[PDB]
Chain A
Amino acid sequence: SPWRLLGALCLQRPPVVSKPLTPLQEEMASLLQQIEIERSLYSDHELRALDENQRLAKKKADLAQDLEDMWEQKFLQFKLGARITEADEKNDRTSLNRKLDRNLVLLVREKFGDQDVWILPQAEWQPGETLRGTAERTLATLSENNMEAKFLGNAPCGHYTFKFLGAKVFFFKALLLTGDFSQAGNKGHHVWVTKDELGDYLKPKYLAQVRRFVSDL
């Protein structure tokens, strides 16, 4: 009965920019702004604008516009951050600049004697250690840079077995606070990827169970 037990860590980076809004949600936001300006109350800006217009009207028979002009000028002068970088999406797939709107996860180049597989990192467990121990051990073995994945739960996230003799990997999940891409020249091609592109990448059906497990969102 030759058995083997492995622990693995699945870090999920949350996106830093909001989702691109659906047109439905866009026109409803416009409508909500409309209803809000309709049922809103007066402000100091409206007070000063209206009463200064009234003062000017009176003085004709006897500012807010400049401020908003200056503010619009400052806005036009200012430069905003870039959302999408198609160049990085093409030639810099192992980076963050390509996608900031959706969550990300990595994939490592793994090789086995029985079958070469493009799968998620894992490591071998030994008795005097916890599964989370093996998880952060894999993390420290693969990272080789200034990044830590903050854990969120001790419970198991995936169970996946395969025979040749028998191997059983248990997946935990974790959160990524920081992350870089130093030591760019690596044997294991670590690449942050989304769920659909991960599905395009890797075949297996234990991995398909991982697909149905992981949240799309």
Chain B
Amino acid sequence: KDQEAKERLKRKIRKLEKATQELIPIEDFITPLKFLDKARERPQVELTFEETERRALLLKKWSLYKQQERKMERDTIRAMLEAQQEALEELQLESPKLHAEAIKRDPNLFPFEKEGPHYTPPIPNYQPPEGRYNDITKV
């Protein structure tokens, strides 16, 4: 009884470990079953020539804007990198050990946590109403 039970246990555990673990489905890549109803469909207002022209002009202007943004981003990052590397090579020339010390990593710098900006700053004295939250998830 003892040996048999232990062997069955261990073997079943080994089989489960060697089983191909499935992946939890993502609800974002699954269209709700209640999205295919033909009663929802909306009338499509045909677009005007002038409105479509405005759309295209806006799109191309924004493309120009974004390429300018990435140009200035390139400029900033290149300047920062070259300046950092100049400082680094100067420190290497001066102190031949502190440059290696700086090149050394540090674990406390890997785990970071930060929030994003807000539409408005926090109010000094603001309390919300009394309520509670509850998470809902499936397998």
Contacts and interface: CB of A to CB of B under 8 A. Distances in A.
Whether chain A touches chain B in the assembled complex (some CB pair under 8 Å): yes
Interface of A: 14-18, 24-25, 27-28, 31, 38, 41-42, 46-47, 80-83, 100, 130-131, 150-159, 168, 170-171, 209, 212-213, 215-217
B58 A15 contact: no
A156 B84 contact: yes
Contacts of B90: 159
Contacts of B42: 42
A83 B120 contact: yes
Nearest to B37: A42
A212 B44 CA distance: 52
A100 B109 contact: no
Given A28-B58, A159-B87, A216-B76, A131 B102 contact: yes
A217 B76 contact: yes
Binding site of B, secondary structure by majority: helix, strand, loop or mixed? helix
Interface residues of B, number: 37
Contacts of A217: 76
B40 interface: yes
Contacts of A14: 117
28 contacts: A17-B117, A24-B61, A24-B65, A27-B58, A28-B62, A42-B40, A47-B40, A80-B120, A81-B121, A81-B123, A82-B120, A82-B121, A152-B109, A154-B101, A154-B105, A154-B106, A155-B103, A156-B87, A157-B84, A158-B87, A159-B86, A159-B90, A168-B94, A170-B87, A170-B91, A171-B87, A215-B76, A216-B76
Contacts of B44: 38
Interface string B8-42: 00000000000000000000000000010000101
Given A41-B35, A82-B121, A154 B102 contact: yes
A130 B117 contact: no
A158 B40 CA distance: 61
A110 B29 CA distance: 59
A159 B91 contact: yes
Interface of B: 35, 40, 42, 44-45, 55, 58, 61-62, 65, 76, 79-80, 83-84, 86-88, 90-91, 94, 98, 101-106, 109, 112, 117-123
A7 to B, nearest CB: 10
A15 B106 contact: no
Contacts of B61: 24
Contacts of A156: 84, 87-88, 91, 102
Nearest to B40: A42
